[PDB]
Design a protein around this ligand. Structure first.
Ligand code: MTP
Ligand code: MTP
Ligand code: MTP
Ligand code: MTP
Ligand code: NA
Ligand code: NA
Lengths: 313, 314
């Protein structure tokens, strides 16, 4: 059972049929759609679709009913979503240009109440989770979640992503120590190092595994002893929107890990889910086709890897 | 009766408590998010109706327009000639405003694209000939067809291209300007119009009856073809909050004053008042008309005599 903590949101996604090369910026967009989102919602949805046991742990508004149904239909346990008395579910508004560059605004709303969520209640309700993802969230919620994981003996994955630029060096440091996984992208890895003052070795001495996504260059899985697995991307055919691609990779990778797959196979599955999200507009708008999944995995990584991956799904 | 053509929209307005000083990947943590009635035509029609003017809104919206229609009709706006799309939703304007009143925004036209199917002939046959038709930012082809139909039926019009000036070609802008009773732009838009059309200042003034050029905090200029220039300073602000719709508000106040028989200067003073009232509220139609506060601020900025003459016709 994987407990996913992080933002729950509605994503208002727009497409600008140009390049962000323009203060009074005005972008004439040719698409506007509203989808389910938030990093925790995305990851929980992806884990549920892939057949994993997952519980969403975040803060939303009373408007969450439909979202809840949508997630429960995919096996996600939403019993422990905090419902705000007053605030609306967070909203992410984003414009993506032809180069997949993005200009976005995030209104937290009910997200600010995630700091009132208590993992002790979740553990008493569902047992101790096999892993807790500490994703982008209310900052205080992120810190309290990590500290409660440490105190209750729960393995956790530090996944600060969008919040890394808004946290101080000390805050980021408090999020990293003891993590079973550390997820960032390459730019975020450099930023984490610069802000915390830690060296690469300093970080690796405190975590069990570093996972660094590299956009089109794939992903690196680095162990504390330097052992590095590089997994290339599942090449894309219909690139459309980058929102939620990292969440998708994390969900696929952690589902594979929970299914007993090795690091490389789990990262290959994560790459598949990531490209499926890249090729759709919303973050949870992708479909799971077992045969197309097997085919694309085999094309990218070989028949043996594809077969071993699809066997556990 | 003033016919207002232009965009009808829902404005999703956010506040960034910082300054826009940030493979682009901009992310702004905002601390306010509100949804309001908008579109340049909706804003101007609302303002004219609130001020007691006779006004008809002429634009394209979606079936979701019912509540907006009720809201506008409660203020005396005639919405009979709003085109309701079978398919599209009302346009949406999404904007983030920083502490310096700088803005980063995206506009989804949606139903606005169908304004090019509106025919001002139907409006005139229904309500008579409007005293003036505002050609505001809209579906570009709709703007051109509206201007040409004004010329064809002999209706006075105000060229008010604003947000669309940067997206139109020189020839397109030129075809929008000729014969206009009014030309509304801001100073940056005036420079851009000259550069894009290749016209000189004199070239423009020879084709219009009046140039109105807003200057942000520096006020507004009203320039006649013979060079006669009236400069009206702003009504100084007390609670600057959001710049969305301020120009629309000025245009509405000014044209209401003009339709009420006020001179150019008095009309521009009223417009400045409405503009600052919009500047001091978040939405574009979220302001209230307080007769006493209006009189007081007009008098403080322009004198008791001007304030009295302005409030007398309202
Ligand atoms: C303080 S900024 C922030 N914080 C938390 N979550 C964010 C933020 N910005 C976007 N999202 C959510 O991330 C998802 C894509 O990973 C998108 O679905 C989007 O909702
Ligand atoms: C911007 S290219 C990219 N980025 C992340 N995942 C991918 C990609 N292509 C396939 N899967
Ligand atoms: C092609 S860009 C565009 N076109 C037409 N109208 C626009 C546009 N952008 C914003 N608006 C509307 O203008 C109002 C503020 O004057 C705001 O209320 C907003 O709705
Ligand atoms: C300080 S900016 C300002 N102040 C007052 N009225 C305005 C302004 N801009 C347009 N009308
Ligand atoms: Na996407
Ligand atoms: Na405003």
């Amino acid at each position: 059972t994987i407990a996913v903590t992080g933002s729950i949101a509605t994503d208002h996604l727009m497409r600008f049929p140009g390049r962000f090369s323009e203060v009074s910026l005005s972008f004439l967009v040719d698409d506007l759609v509203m989808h389910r989102g938030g990093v925790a919602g995305n990851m929980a949805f992806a884990i549920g679709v892939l057949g994993g046991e997952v519980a969403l742990v975040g803060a939303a508004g009373a408007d969450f009913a439909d979202y809840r149904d949508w997630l429960k239909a995919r096996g996600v346990n939403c019993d422990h979503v905090l419902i705000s008395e007053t605030a609306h579910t967070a909203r992410f508004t984003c414009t993506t240009d032809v180069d997949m560059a993005q200009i976005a605004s995030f209104y937290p709303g009910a997200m600010s109440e995630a700091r009132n969520i208590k993992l002790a209640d979740v553990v008493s309700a569902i047992g101790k989770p096999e892993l807790v993802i500490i994703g982008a969230n209310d900052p205080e919620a992120m810190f309290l979640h990590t500290e409660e994981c440490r105190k209750l003996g729960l393995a956790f994955a530090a996944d600060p992503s969008q919040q890394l630029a808004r946290l101080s060096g000390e805050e980021i440091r408090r999020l990293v120590n003891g993590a079973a996984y550390l997820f960032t992208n390459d730019y975020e890895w450099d930023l984490l190092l610069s802000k915390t003052g830690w060296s690469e070795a300093d970080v690796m001495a405190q975590i069990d595994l570093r996972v660094t996504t590299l956009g089109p260059k794939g992903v690196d899985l680095v162990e504390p002893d330097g052992t590095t697995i590089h997994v290339g991307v599942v090449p894309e055919t219909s690139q459309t929107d980058p929102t939620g691609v990292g969440d998708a990779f994390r969900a696929g990778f952690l589902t594979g890990r929970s299914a007993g797959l090795g690091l490389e196979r789990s990262a290959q599955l994560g790459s598949l889910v990531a490209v499926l999200v890249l090729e759709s507009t919303g973050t949870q708008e992708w479909q799971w086709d077992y045969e197309a999944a097997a085919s694309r995995l085999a094309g990218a990584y070989g028949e043996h890897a594809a077969a071993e991956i699809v066997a556990v799904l």
